[PDB]
């Protein structure tokens, strides 16, 4: 049961939740990876890792993924959360030097992950381990695009560092552009392809219906995170959240801002339902009779299915994960699972 201010009946009724059969193993393997790569303190992994639900979130998303592919995606996903925590703590403690160095190392590791598998910074070595494995599934053309996309994500984190250091809250439109990067829209979109076993040609994945379906899936996920993570983020002096930009620049009250974010999230859903029809008509057009057309048709169909699955996975993740349960913390500004 979800709180009325967070509840989305259309999700509950029309996007039934899915779970990949590898999830029980996935849960433990990622937990152990976090442990052995020293990405989270050992006692924090035992106390909090399972309750954080990072593996549940990916296992509800990339349905159909080879077990190995889902494992690398889940390790990378968990790493991303730990990176978000590190970024947060570097900002809070004014470690601009340590953040700048991490940022540079991540850019280099991204292009040559093999070189960085045993780097002395365990956050960098962990990144490189997951990225090296992601690079093993599809041609190097897909790897180059993932890298291009993630260099942009790191730089958006650097922009957030600048904003929070200066006490700047982005305008609403500026925020919406930044959020496509800090949420890593195009990374989750990229990872649809190794999950269905096919790198999509530019002409296919840039078709308007595929692009728009892919975008709305991510806008929904990012803004729903904004809605649900607003309490802990206000508490932690986070300034990046659609709700916070509206309060700051459109002078809404908190209640008005929650309402406005809800309405924007709702519209993503019914916009997605419209363009999903087009995206699936496109998948049928790809099935032209040929082997390649059938491969491409099947892959777009799977990808669009998972774009849909993201809605329910993200929806339930925010109600299940301890990441957001600020009311339970001794210090509302310092989550228990973060290394402070
Ligand atoms: C901070 C984590 N993340 C990706 C794991 C940043 C790129 C956004 C996110 C939050 C909640 C659900 C899904 C993604
Ligand atoms: Mg963040
Ligand atoms: Mg965050
Ligand atoms: Mg958030």
GROMACS .gro file of C-alpha atoms and ligand atoms in nm:
model
  357
    1UNK     CA    1   0.000   0.000   0.000
    2UNK     CA    2   0.142   0.340  -0.110
    3UNK     CA    3   0.068   0.678   0.061
    4UNK     CA    4  -0.193   0.885  -0.130
    5UNK     CA    5   0.054   1.167  -0.192
    6UNK     CA    6   0.289   0.915  -0.361
    7UNK     CA    7   0.033   0.676  -0.511
    8UNK     CA    8  -0.014   0.631  -0.887
    9UNK     CA    9  -0.321   0.422  -0.957
   10UNK     CA   10  -0.237   0.392  -1.329
   11UNK     CA   11   0.095   0.222  -1.236
   12UNK     CA   12  -0.079  -0.007  -0.989
   13UNK     CA   13  -0.349  -0.109  -1.232
   14UNK     CA   14  -0.180  -0.104  -1.569
   15UNK     CA   15   0.196  -0.166  -1.515
   16UNK     CA   16   0.213  -0.495  -1.326
   17UNK     CA   17   0.540  -0.554  -1.157
   18UNK     CA   18   0.793  -0.804  -1.310
   19UNK     CA   19   1.083  -0.991  -1.154
   20UNK     CA   20   1.378  -1.156  -1.332
   21UNK     CA   21   1.428  -1.520  -1.214
   22UNK     CA   22   1.795  -1.459  -1.136
   23UNK     CA   23   1.708  -1.206  -0.862
   24UNK     CA   24   1.773  -1.425  -0.554
   25UNK     CA   25   2.125  -1.499  -0.670
   26UNK     CA   26   2.168  -1.148  -0.797
   27UNK     CA   27   2.083  -1.011  -0.449
   28UNK     CA   28   2.361  -1.199  -0.278
   29UNK     CA   29   2.622  -1.171  -0.554
   30UNK     CA   30   2.600  -0.791  -0.562
   31UNK     CA   31   2.604  -0.778  -0.179
   32UNK     CA   32   2.919  -0.984  -0.182
   33UNK     CA   33   3.070  -0.773  -0.463
   34UNK     CA   34   3.019  -0.456  -0.254
   35UNK     CA   35   3.188  -0.633   0.032
   36UNK     CA   36   3.485  -0.771  -0.154
   37UNK     CA   37   3.547  -0.455  -0.355
   38UNK     CA   38   3.531  -0.259  -0.029
   39UNK     CA   39   3.270  -0.020  -0.165
   40UNK     CA   40   3.077  -0.011   0.160
   41UNK     CA   41   3.193  -0.075   0.516
   42UNK     CA   42   3.146  -0.441   0.606
   43UNK     CA   43   2.906  -0.375   0.893
   44UNK     CA   44   2.700  -0.137   0.675
   45UNK     CA   45   2.673  -0.400   0.404
   46UNK     CA   46   2.545  -0.659   0.651
   47UNK     CA   47   2.304  -0.423   0.817
   48UNK     CA   48   2.171  -0.228   0.518
   49UNK     CA   49   2.260  -0.369   0.173
   50UNK     CA   50   1.964  -0.602   0.120
   51UNK     CA   51   1.717  -0.346   0.260
   52UNK     CA   52   1.851  -0.088   0.008
   53UNK     CA   53   1.692  -0.297  -0.274
   54UNK     CA   54   1.937  -0.192  -0.549
   55UNK     CA   55   1.929  -0.540  -0.707
   56UNK     CA   56   1.545  -0.556  -0.690
   57UNK     CA   57   1.535  -0.232  -0.883
   58UNK     CA   58   1.742  -0.369  -1.175
   59UNK     CA   59   1.581  -0.717  -1.164
   60UNK     CA   60   1.241  -0.547  -1.214
   61UNK     CA   61   1.374  -0.356  -1.515
   62UNK     CA   62   1.596  -0.554  -1.752
   63UNK     CA   63   1.370  -0.860  -1.790
   64UNK     CA   64   1.509  -1.116  -2.033
   65UNK     CA   65   1.872  -1.021  -1.965
   66UNK     CA   66   2.133  -1.300  -1.963
   67UNK     CA   67   2.222  -1.371  -1.601
   68UNK     CA   68   2.580  -1.241  -1.657
   69UNK     CA   69   2.453  -0.921  -1.813
   70UNK     CA   70   2.210  -0.857  -1.532
   71UNK     CA   71   2.493  -0.920  -1.282
   72UNK     CA   72   2.722  -0.659  -1.434
   73UNK     CA   73   2.431  -0.411  -1.459
   74UNK     CA   74   2.336  -0.470  -1.096
   75UNK     CA   75   2.695  -0.429  -0.973
   76UNK     CA   76   2.731  -0.107  -1.179
   77UNK     CA   77   2.392   0.014  -1.045
   78UNK     CA   78   2.494  -0.047  -0.685
   79UNK     CA   79   2.826   0.121  -0.755
   80UNK     CA   80   2.632   0.423  -0.894
   81UNK     CA   81   2.443   0.457  -0.568
   82UNK     CA   82   2.763   0.437  -0.365
   83UNK     CA   83   2.915   0.701  -0.599
   84UNK     CA   84   2.611   0.926  -0.539
   85UNK     CA   85   2.680   0.882  -0.164
   86UNK     CA   86   3.052   0.962  -0.207
   87UNK     CA   87   2.970   1.269  -0.419
   88UNK     CA   88   2.726   1.382  -0.148
   89UNK     CA   89   2.978   1.333   0.130
   90UNK     CA   90   3.259   1.512  -0.065
   91UNK     CA   91   3.028   1.810  -0.112
   92UNK     CA   92   2.910   1.809   0.251
   93UNK     CA   93   3.267   1.795   0.383
   94UNK     CA   94   3.414   2.037   0.127
   95UNK     CA   95   3.654   1.785  -0.026
   96UNK     CA   96   3.679   1.958  -0.363
   97UNK     CA   97   4.029   1.820  -0.415
   98UNK     CA   98   3.926   1.461  -0.356
   99UNK     CA   99   3.619   1.501  -0.576
  100UNK     CA  100   3.825   1.655  -0.860
  101UNK     CA  101   4.069   1.369  -0.850
  102UNK     CA  102   3.792   1.106  -0.841
  103UNK     CA  103   3.623   1.273  -1.133
  104UNK     CA  104   3.940   1.264  -1.343
  105UNK     CA  105   4.010   0.902  -1.251
  106UNK     CA  106   3.654   0.801  -1.346
  107UNK     CA  107   3.685   0.967  -1.687
  108UNK     CA  108   4.013   0.771  -1.755
  109UNK     CA  109   3.881   0.439  -1.611
  110UNK     CA  110   3.576   0.476  -1.830
  111UNK     CA  111   3.785   0.478  -2.144
  112UNK     CA  112   4.036   0.211  -2.019
  113UNK     CA  113   3.872   0.011  -1.747
  114UNK     CA  114   4.126  -0.277  -1.766
  115UNK     CA  115   4.403  -0.043  -1.662
  116UNK     CA  116   4.215   0.051  -1.347
  117UNK     CA  117   4.098  -0.291  -1.213
  118UNK     CA  118   4.344  -0.273  -0.922
  119UNK     CA  119   4.359   0.097  -0.864
  120UNK     CA  120   4.430   0.205  -0.509
  121UNK     CA  121   4.101   0.396  -0.489
  122UNK     CA  122   3.852   0.117  -0.430
  123UNK     CA  123   3.565   0.325  -0.569
  124UNK     CA  124   3.762   0.356  -0.896
  125UNK     CA  125   3.859  -0.012  -0.905
  126UNK     CA  126   3.494  -0.111  -0.842
  127UNK     CA  127   3.376   0.111  -1.126
  128UNK     CA  128   3.635  -0.030  -1.363
  129UNK     CA  129   3.542  -0.392  -1.274
  130UNK     CA  130   3.173  -0.336  -1.359
  131UNK     CA  131   3.249  -0.132  -1.671
  132UNK     CA  132   3.501  -0.383  -1.804
  133UNK     CA  133   3.232  -0.647  -1.784
  134UNK     CA  134   2.968  -0.432  -1.947
  135UNK     CA  135   3.217  -0.379  -2.234
  136UNK     CA  136   3.237  -0.752  -2.300
  137UNK     CA  137   2.886  -0.811  -2.434
  138UNK     CA  138   2.841  -0.603  -2.753
  139UNK     CA  139   3.077  -0.462  -3.024
  140UNK     CA  140   3.310  -0.179  -2.930
  141UNK     CA  141   3.076   0.062  -3.109
  142UNK     CA  142   2.829   0.015  -2.821
  143UNK     CA  143   3.112   0.061  -2.565
  144UNK     CA  144   3.209   0.396  -2.720
  145UNK     CA  145   2.851   0.523  -2.691
  146UNK     CA  146   2.820   0.409  -2.325
  147UNK     CA  147   3.147   0.589  -2.256
  148UNK     CA  148   3.038   0.905  -2.438
  149UNK     CA  149   2.718   0.903  -2.238
  150UNK     CA  150   2.885   0.844  -1.904
  151UNK     CA  151   3.161   1.108  -1.952
  152UNK     CA  152   2.860   1.346  -1.971
  153UNK     CA  153   2.710   1.204  -1.650
  154UNK     CA  154   3.035   1.254  -1.455
  155UNK     CA  155   3.044   1.617  -1.575
  156UNK     CA  156   2.683   1.665  -1.462
  157UNK     CA  157   2.784   1.541  -1.118
  158UNK     CA  158   3.064   1.798  -1.132
  159UNK     CA  159   2.805   2.062  -1.217
  160UNK     CA  160   2.607   1.955  -0.910
  161UNK     CA  161   2.923   1.987  -0.703
  162UNK     CA  162   2.957   2.350  -0.825
  163UNK     CA  163   2.589   2.429  -0.760
  164UNK     CA  164   2.587   2.292  -0.403
  165UNK     CA  165   2.920   2.444  -0.318
  166UNK     CA  166   2.782   2.780  -0.427
  167UNK     CA  167   2.433   2.731  -0.286
  168UNK     CA  168   2.275   2.757  -0.632
  169UNK     CA  169   1.935   2.597  -0.704
  170UNK     CA  170   1.893   2.545  -1.080
  171UNK     CA  171   1.595   2.702  -1.251
  172UNK     CA  172   1.320   2.455  -1.343
  173UNK     CA  173   1.410   2.425  -1.712
  174UNK     CA  174   1.784   2.422  -1.640
  175UNK     CA  175   1.714   2.152  -1.383
  176UNK     CA  176   1.515   1.939  -1.625
  177UNK     CA  177   1.807   1.939  -1.870
  178UNK     CA  178   2.061   1.861  -1.599
  179UNK     CA  179   1.846   1.580  -1.458
  180UNK     CA  180   1.859   1.378  -1.782
  181UNK     CA  181   2.232   1.359  -1.709
  182UNK     CA  182   2.247   1.320  -1.330
  183UNK     CA  183   1.988   1.048  -1.343
  184UNK     CA  184   2.186   0.888  -1.630
  185UNK     CA  185   1.886   0.854  -1.865
  186UNK     CA  186   2.095   0.754  -2.165
  187UNK     CA  187   2.299   0.497  -1.969
  188UNK     CA  188   1.988   0.303  -1.860
  189UNK     CA  189   1.864   0.341  -2.214
  190UNK     CA  190   2.198   0.208  -2.354
  191UNK     CA  191   2.188  -0.092  -2.115
  192UNK     CA  192   1.861  -0.208  -2.269
  193UNK     CA  193   2.067  -0.335  -2.564
  194UNK     CA  194   2.303  -0.584  -2.397
  195UNK     CA  195   1.995  -0.698  -2.206
  196UNK     CA  196   1.821  -0.802  -2.527
  197UNK     CA  197   2.143  -0.916  -2.692
  198UNK     CA  198   2.160  -0.666  -2.974
  199UNK     CA  199   2.328  -0.330  -3.044
  200UNK     CA  200   2.062  -0.123  -3.221
  201UNK     CA  201   2.171   0.070  -3.533
  202UNK     CA  202   2.153   0.451  -3.499
  203UNK     CA  203   1.863   0.461  -3.744
  204UNK     CA  204   1.661   0.228  -3.524
  205UNK     CA  205   1.729   0.372  -3.181
  206UNK     CA  206   1.693   0.730  -3.310
  207UNK     CA  207   1.351   0.661  -3.467
  208UNK     CA  208   1.117   0.922  -3.301
  209UNK     CA  209   0.893   0.668  -3.130
  210UNK     CA  210   1.184   0.472  -2.981
  211UNK     CA  211   1.356   0.792  -2.859
  212UNK     CA  212   1.041   0.938  -2.711
  213UNK     CA  213   0.938   0.615  -2.537
  214UNK     CA  214   1.295   0.590  -2.399
  215UNK     CA  215   1.289   0.949  -2.281
  216UNK     CA  216   0.948   0.930  -2.104
  217UNK     CA  217   1.045   0.609  -1.921
  218UNK     CA  218   1.342   0.798  -1.775
  219UNK     CA  219   1.163   1.130  -1.710
  220UNK     CA  220   0.906   0.935  -1.513
  221UNK     CA  221   1.173   0.753  -1.316
  222UNK     CA  222   1.380   1.064  -1.238
  223UNK     CA  223   1.087   1.282  -1.138
  224UNK     CA  224   0.931   1.004  -0.931
  225UNK     CA  225   1.264   0.975  -0.754
  226UNK     CA  226   1.245   1.354  -0.700
  227UNK     CA  227   0.893   1.315  -0.551
  228UNK     CA  228   0.992   1.031  -0.315
  229UNK     CA  229   1.345   1.145  -0.224
  230UNK     CA  230   1.239   1.508  -0.151
  231UNK     CA  231   1.222   1.454   0.230
  232UNK     CA  232   1.571   1.311   0.265
  233UNK     CA  233   1.710   1.559   0.016
  234UNK     CA  234   1.566   1.866   0.190
  235UNK     CA  235   1.704   1.718   0.511
  236UNK     CA  236   2.050   1.676   0.359
  237UNK     CA  237   2.068   2.021   0.190
  238UNK     CA  238   2.049   1.863  -0.155
  239UNK     CA  239   1.942   2.134  -0.401
  240UNK     CA  240   1.880   1.910  -0.705
  241UNK     CA  241   1.514   1.806  -0.717
  242UNK     CA  242   1.230   1.934  -0.938
  243UNK     CA  243   1.034   2.010  -0.621
  244UNK     CA  244   1.313   2.227  -0.485
  245UNK     CA  245   1.349   2.424  -0.809
  246UNK     CA  246   0.972   2.490  -0.810
  247UNK     CA  247   0.967   2.601  -0.447
  248UNK     CA  248   1.269   2.823  -0.508
  249UNK     CA  249   1.194   2.975  -0.845
  250UNK     CA  250   0.815   2.953  -0.885
  251UNK     CA  251   0.763   3.021  -0.513
  252UNK     CA  252   0.536   2.724  -0.454
  253UNK     CA  253   0.471   2.590  -0.109
  254UNK     CA  254   0.592   2.240  -0.036
  255UNK     CA  255   0.239   2.103  -0.076
  256UNK     CA  256   0.197   2.285  -0.411
  257UNK     CA  257   0.534   2.160  -0.526
  258UNK     CA  258   0.450   1.798  -0.439
  259UNK     CA  259   0.125   1.839  -0.631
  260UNK     CA  260   0.300   1.984  -0.938
  261UNK     CA  261   0.569   1.711  -0.938
  262UNK     CA  262   0.290   1.447  -0.909
  263UNK     CA  263   0.106   1.591  -1.207
  264UNK     CA  264   0.424   1.594  -1.416
  265UNK     CA  265   0.493   1.231  -1.321
  266UNK     CA  266   0.133   1.133  -1.409
  267UNK     CA  267   0.160   1.293  -1.755
  268UNK     CA  268   0.475   1.093  -1.828
  269UNK     CA  269   0.271   0.778  -1.786
  270UNK     CA  270  -0.014   0.860  -2.023
  271UNK     CA  271   0.230   1.017  -2.273
  272UNK     CA  272   0.428   0.692  -2.262
  273UNK     CA  273   0.113   0.487  -2.319
  274UNK     CA  274   0.049   0.686  -2.641
  275UNK     CA  275   0.395   0.664  -2.782
  276UNK     CA  276   0.434   0.301  -2.672
  277UNK     CA  277   0.174   0.219  -2.938
  278UNK     CA  278   0.389   0.390  -3.198
  279UNK     CA  279   0.708   0.226  -3.073
  280UNK     CA  280   0.548  -0.117  -3.097
  281UNK     CA  281   0.410  -0.035  -3.449
  282UNK     CA  282   0.773   0.044  -3.540
  283UNK     CA  283   0.890  -0.291  -3.399
  284UNK     CA  284   0.632  -0.463  -3.621
  285UNK     CA  285   0.750  -0.266  -3.925
  286UNK     CA  286   1.108  -0.390  -3.859
  287UNK     CA  287   0.992  -0.746  -3.899
  288UNK     CA  288   1.033  -0.725  -4.274
  289UNK     CA  289   1.067  -1.094  -4.346
  290UNK     CA  290   1.442  -1.114  -4.299
  291UNK     CA  291   1.645  -1.270  -4.023
  292UNK     CA  292   1.800  -0.937  -3.930
  293UNK     CA  293   1.458  -0.765  -3.932
  294UNK     CA  294   1.319  -1.029  -3.699
  295UNK     CA  295   1.626  -0.988  -3.469
  296UNK     CA  296   1.579  -0.610  -3.474
  297UNK     CA  297   1.203  -0.629  -3.430
  298UNK     CA  298   1.239  -0.863  -3.133
  299UNK     CA  299   1.503  -0.647  -2.973
  300UNK     CA  300   1.302  -0.320  -2.999
  301UNK     CA  301   0.999  -0.502  -2.868
  302UNK     CA  302   1.199  -0.630  -2.568
  303UNK     CA  303   1.354  -0.292  -2.506
  304UNK     CA  304   1.019  -0.111  -2.516
  305UNK     CA  305   0.881  -0.380  -2.279
  306UNK     CA  306   1.160  -0.294  -2.033
  307UNK     CA  307   1.106   0.077  -2.082
  308UNK     CA  308   0.756  -0.005  -1.954
  309UNK     CA  309   0.895  -0.223  -1.674
  310UNK     CA  310   1.104   0.065  -1.547
  311UNK     CA  311   0.783   0.246  -1.444
  312UNK     CA  312   0.676  -0.032  -1.203
  313UNK     CA  313   1.027  -0.117  -1.086
  314UNK     CA  314   1.106   0.242  -0.991
  315UNK     CA  315   0.762   0.292  -0.839
  316UNK     CA  316   0.790  -0.003  -0.596
  317UNK     CA  317   1.164   0.049  -0.531
  318UNK     CA  318   1.095   0.385  -0.371
  319UNK     CA  319   0.847   0.235  -0.128
  320UNK     CA  320   1.061  -0.068  -0.043
  321UNK     CA  321   1.417   0.075  -0.025
  322UNK     CA  322   1.563   0.197   0.305
  323UNK     CA  323   1.752   0.463   0.110
  324UNK     CA  324   1.460   0.704   0.145
  325UNK     CA  325   1.333   0.639   0.498
  326UNK     CA  326   1.455   0.962   0.651
  327UNK     CA  327   1.202   0.943   0.936
  328UNK     CA  328   1.395   0.649   1.076
  329UNK     CA  329   1.739   0.811   1.103
  330UNK     CA  330   1.906   0.956   1.413
  331UNK     CA  331   2.045   1.241   1.198
  332UNK     CA  332   1.811   1.325   0.914
  333UNK     CA  333   2.099   1.481   0.726
  334UNK     CA  334   2.321   1.170   0.747
  335UNK     CA  335   2.181   0.841   0.616
  336UNK     CA  336   2.295   0.534   0.814
  337UNK     CA  337   2.428   0.355   0.505
  338UNK     CA  338   2.659   0.640   0.404
  339UNK     CA  339   3.029   0.647   0.503
  340UNK     CA  340   3.057   0.978   0.688
  341LIG     C1  341   2.170   0.800  -0.744
  341LIG     C2  342   2.137   0.673  -0.827
  341LIG     N1  343   2.101   0.704  -0.970
  341LIG     C3  344   2.125   0.580  -1.052
  341LIG     C4  345   2.147   0.443  -0.971
  341LIG     C5  346   2.196   0.809  -1.014
  341LIG     C6  347   2.248   0.787  -1.158
  341LIG     C7  348   1.959   0.757  -0.982
  341LIG     C8  349   1.838   0.662  -0.940
  341LIG     C9  350   1.774   0.677  -0.815
  341LIG    C10  351   1.667   0.594  -0.780
  341LIG    C11  352   1.619   0.495  -0.867
  341LIG    C12  353   1.681   0.480  -0.992
  341LIG    C13  354   1.788   0.561  -1.027
  342LIG    MG1  355   2.260   1.241  -0.716
  343LIG    MG1  356   2.138   1.154  -0.443
  344LIG    MG1  357   1.670   1.194  -0.549
   0.00000   0.00000   0.00000
